[PDB]
Design an enzyme around this catalytic site. Sequence first.
Site, short mmCIF file in Angstrom:
data_model
loop_
_atom_site.label_atom_id
_atom_site.label_comp_id
_atom_site.label_asym_id
_atom_site.label_seq_id
_atom_site.Cartn_x
_atom_site.Cartn_y
_atom_site.Cartn_z
N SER B 130 0.82 -1.20 0.00
CA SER B 130 0.00 0.00 0.00
C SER B 130 0.87 1.27 0.00
O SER B 130 1.44 1.61 -1.04
CB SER B 130 -0.99 -0.07 1.17
OG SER B 130 -2.00 0.92 1.15
N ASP B 154 -0.38 -3.98 -4.13
CA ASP B 154 -1.50 -3.05 -4.28
C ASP B 154 -1.13 -1.68 -3.71
O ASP B 154 -1.67 -1.29 -2.66
CB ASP B 154 -2.82 -3.59 -3.70
CG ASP B 154 -4.05 -2.94 -4.33
OD1 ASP B 154 -4.05 -2.72 -5.56
OD2 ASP B 154 -5.03 -2.69 -3.59
N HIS B 226 -7.65 -5.36 -1.01
CA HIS B 226 -6.36 -4.64 -0.90
C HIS B 226 -5.24 -5.61 -0.46
O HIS B 226 -4.23 -5.76 -1.17
CB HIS B 226 -6.53 -3.52 0.14
CG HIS B 226 -5.46 -2.47 0.16
ND1 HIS B 226 -4.80 -2.08 -0.98
CD2 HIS B 226 -5.04 -1.71 1.20
CE1 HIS B 226 -3.97 -1.13 -0.61
NE2 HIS B 226 -4.09 -0.87 0.70
#
Lengths: 81, 422
Positions: B130, B154, B226
């Site tokens: 992330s 992601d 995610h």
Amino acid sequence: LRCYTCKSLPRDERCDLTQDCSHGQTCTTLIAHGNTESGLLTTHSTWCTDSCQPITKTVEGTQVTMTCCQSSLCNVPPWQS
Amino acid sequence: QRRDFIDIESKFALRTPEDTAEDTCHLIPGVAESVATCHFNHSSKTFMVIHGWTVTGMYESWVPKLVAALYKREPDSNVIVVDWLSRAQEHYPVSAGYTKLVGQDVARFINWMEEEFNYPLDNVHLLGYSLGAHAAGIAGSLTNKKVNRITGLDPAGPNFEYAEAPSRLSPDDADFVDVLHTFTRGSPGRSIGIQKPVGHVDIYPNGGTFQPGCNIGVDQLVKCSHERSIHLFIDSLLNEENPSKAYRCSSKEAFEKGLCLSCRKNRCNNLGYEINKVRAKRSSKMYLKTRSQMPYKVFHYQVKIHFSGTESETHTNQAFEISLYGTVAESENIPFTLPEVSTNKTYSFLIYTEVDIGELLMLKLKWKSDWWSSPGFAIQKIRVKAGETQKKVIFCSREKVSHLQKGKAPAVFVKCHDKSLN
Ligand SMILES: *[C@@H]1O[C@H](CO)[C@@H](O)[C@H](O)[C@H]1NC(C)=O
Ligand SMILES: *[C@@H]1O[C@H](CO)[C@@H](O)[C@H](O)[C@H]1NC(C)=O
Ligand SMILES: [Ca+2]
């Protein structure tokens, strides 16, 4: 190598088709035997395959037989030669 | 030298295969003795795990899982967990700004290891999740020499979607940047995951918008799509023998029609750790389908059917079922619906399965559901392309033609030809 290259022929039909195979290729014969909406039918398919592995499997009431071959024009069903 | 690195807030914990959950031993920048205390093996490659945003300021439960998978796959390697938890437990746009400082701390640590112990940066693989993918990329851009690899799991999208290359993960940050996009759902700049390709290989599992097994039924529900990027990567670490194939395609829509299942000159690649480190002029956006659970691997097939009739008939939103039978196993009643089914028209479509059927033998096709006679199409052949094996297979009707009638018996097709594409 030269193999017979025919798609789903009726049992009592001879393959008049041939193909010069690529490197590492063998002759395969696939026989399908089972019930149709035209009675119990036997078909045979033949071609040059890269890696042939013999098998006999009954799939949903259809006996499927694959055989393998190293000599020219040898992919002939047992009932023909 | 400790004076020179005293401003660094990020901590570098060298975890071990036996102790994967806790930050027991720290590699402290400027203190060469700490490297020996933590038993860093100078002969082995280094994996630096970089977490994302944490609403609780503590490690998310995926961290011990990734560290465990990296030591299982690479037992002699060094798995360093980068701790930037205080900077990661702030209002999102604050924490997103902190990736530049965490990136600087990571680069200064990588440079201290190079300078102090002549450790090669070509032995460094950065795995950022992330916000961590962005901080991994910022770090990569500040090393004295390029790092070998960065894996973006992601990467975060808000504030990075329109960000310039120095402010985010970019292909210039490492010799090889590989990205997994799994939560791109939303408009650009308002998607949890980044939409835009940011690596050399950008993989988009299930379109990349959302992941299977993530529809409803700490904030675990809102983040599974995610976080699936880490679990997709863990799965690749745990199955070196059977990697999941990704396929380069013009769009996610063209991939859904079975149009992109080619392996010719890096048009297919391995998702995860076993990826072929192929750099290209433009980024190759890649696609694949997956299961809802680990092992995530599926088998992709393109199915082409020509529907032949006597009279000009057109039927909309028609439901079908496809059964595939192989030498190993079978996969029955696979549903698919077609928007339009016309007379003397061909249709292509992607079919996928968790089942390893082996080499295809038989294909069964069912047309799912008196004032009117049931409609029907005569089908002689069905062509199938198998992505994983790279085989073009032809199935032809047992009789002259196989009649496909709505609500009636399925059409049966047997293999009549095989070709290898390589
Ligand atoms: C250090 O790593 C090498 C491989 O890079 C391995 O052969 C060696 O056994 C490791 N040393 C220790 C202390 O385990
Ligand atoms: C479909 O094609 C066949 C010839 O292959 C023809 O006999 C039949 O009339 C065609 N049907 C229509 C409606 O065009
Ligand atoms: Ca960058």
